[PDB]
Amino acid sequence: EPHRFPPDFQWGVATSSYQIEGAVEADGRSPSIWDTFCARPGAIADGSTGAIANDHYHRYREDIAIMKQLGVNAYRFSIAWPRILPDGRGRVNQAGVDFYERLVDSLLEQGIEPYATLYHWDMPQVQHDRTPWYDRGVVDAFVEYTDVITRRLSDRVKYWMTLNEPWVISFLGYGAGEHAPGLRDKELYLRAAHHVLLAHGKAMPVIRANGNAQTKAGIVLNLNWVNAASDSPEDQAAARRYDQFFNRWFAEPLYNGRYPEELLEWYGRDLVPVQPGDFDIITTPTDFLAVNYYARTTVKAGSTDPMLQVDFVRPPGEYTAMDWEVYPQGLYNILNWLHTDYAPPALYVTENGAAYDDQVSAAGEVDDPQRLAYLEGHFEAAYRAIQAGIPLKGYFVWSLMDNFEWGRGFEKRFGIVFVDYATQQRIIKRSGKWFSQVTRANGLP
Amino acid sequence: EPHRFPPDFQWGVATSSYQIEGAVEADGRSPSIWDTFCARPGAIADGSTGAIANDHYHRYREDIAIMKQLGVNAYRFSIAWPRILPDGRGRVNQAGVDFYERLVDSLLEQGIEPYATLYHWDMPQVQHDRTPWYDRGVVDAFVEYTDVITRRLSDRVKYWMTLNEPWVISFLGYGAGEHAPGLRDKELYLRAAHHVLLAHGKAMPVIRANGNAQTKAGIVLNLNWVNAASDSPEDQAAARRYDQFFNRWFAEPLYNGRYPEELLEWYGRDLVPVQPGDFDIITTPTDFLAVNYYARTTVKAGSTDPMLQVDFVRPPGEYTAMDWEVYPQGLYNILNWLHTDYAPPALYVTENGAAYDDQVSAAGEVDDPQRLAYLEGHFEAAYRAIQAGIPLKGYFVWSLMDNFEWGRGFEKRFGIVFVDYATQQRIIKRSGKWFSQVTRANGLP
């Protein structure tokens, strides 16, 4: 049954720098906000840090060989600002730039297209000391960083992502206190959210300028399918607020030059530090929109989250180890919504995947049928989306291998490749072996 | 017959270092956590900082002369750890030590007894980067600082206070995000609360050892009178939780070696990082208990404060510009409770005062009848406490002069002396002139 994807479809896997690289003091790297945050009691559920991680800084070539086994034609990673500009600004760290040159050279040598994320949450601590995301001066700082690295890599890297998951950077970082730098303030989150958008917009012309005609760039948004727990007006309203908060807070500014009004009013409109011309910057044209999709979230009115006055409900269904509902149809729905409402020239699924408890068998294999079924359903939903004329150009599985899952530490494994953290051994999981077939087939089954 | 106080009663005024000193970069001083926190948008209501304050670092002699006008025989101030040990630990900054030597010498020369607070919220930023209050290593850091300064000043300073308002340092700093360092987490607040108590206990033997037979030391607790909004069980329980949170959380450990059990259970007892021997340390005997009293707080069951599940009610009555209820009877009730329940050998009111909108009249005077009436009622309540056999030894008005009121900035004026921040001119207010008679009469006119 030829459920084949388009002939140039990009099949990849995704990682982020602090999640896999380790080697946190190597070669002039300065501490990121995450290096500092992991020190805080209760911040990381298993008490771990990203100090070693997958040790990908040293093991990249081996990982690239794994990718060859996987059959991917694309690889999404992030570049660590602390390696490039350890003082946050000013002097370029040659050694740091050199790592990414070696990585990109190795990828292209193996026929793997590099998709580079500029910012995936690891701002140098020294830069955050000067300009936290709630401080407008952060925009120029991120742009300087973008300029340095893009000038060095634009000859080899064609696809760039500006910032990964604005909602996470702003809300979790500054609103819920769950991610670095670990603050919890509604105003700080809204300021951070606005400045992330501004940084994305100011960065785009820089990327295009340091590139060539082939250069493509966009932002990466986390989106999930949102449902109301019931038909009650309070629940419909709760769902609508959460949807505006999670899914529309960035998309509407990016495409329509406005924040969702009802949520804006509810917050207090003056808390967003919009200045004249900001929306013109924010709406700067992009080549694509990248989407990170994981789950359906079902909402009712309540007090669990005091800021939005909502509670979360779990419909009967299948759940991952992250307590996230498995809802493959949600991916189709999100792609369709973006395509009908904003009409981006191209879409990419830059992240999709699942965490389940994995064990290594006596045979030395990792049998993960739940994760495989998860991936299968979502790939199917993406295939349906393409058949419906949605311009989905690629799909990147989160993640290549198990890694530091932020506040959950190393306890939640998202990889299609298992990592034994005692020895750094990599074992391709059953889902990974299956994926090796999908990529070569292009794709299902 | 006159309501005369005891013949040796200490009448004073109080300040803190960051609130009055200014000169934040002078003579080797490093940034405190408050210098950093003032940079945060929304942190300070009027957008101000403590960079200049009352410029007391330069103007201390002038201020001391004002104290003489006021007739005080005692002065409560705090010492800045950032001046003494700018690197947080290690090298003593002799210029910093020198300011406090000159301050104390000048005070004793005028017959004013110094009452010195070791920690009034200004940890050096560099030290906080190593040991925040939630990190147990903070205890030895504070003890080192205590040791250095007590050796230099113990020959002239007899009365020492270890830490000012544990509840503020831990809850406002780490639990509500309102004070530096601006974090909002239940676990972090409880760890901080416990470590402040431990710092107090470890500090006491150091202060005693560096001193002589005259040396007296204690902690300073903020306490307010708490009332339930009604007789409903939900309201009583809410009031109980708040009382335990605000008034008993520190006092019960200090005197009985335990935290209030019901609130402890409510929080989750594992969050307090109690280790063996800690309570033996926390209960180390003190010479006195210092009390900071301002208001009556009325509580009902509610979801406004989600951590305690309480709401606040304003009974019909008189309110200051801080929106705090004026209830002088509360002061007597608090003193009586401490005296009956814990029997401290001595008590001091280390802070009591009020903020009202002040204006300078055309005649160049500040007529503040509401602040005057506030002070009169509370002084009367203190007089009643002494007649009841409570061993109240002194009363310090907050504050000598208008100053940086933390999160409210300079907009809230607590002084009995007005400060025109445009010129640094000091105008003794009417309440201050009135107080000048109380001290000299040693009781209420």
Ligand code: NI
């Ligand atoms: Ni079919």
Ligand code: NI
């Ligand atoms: Ni009488």
Ligand code: NI
């Ligand atoms: Ni000077």
Ligand code: NI
């Ligand atoms: Ni511990």
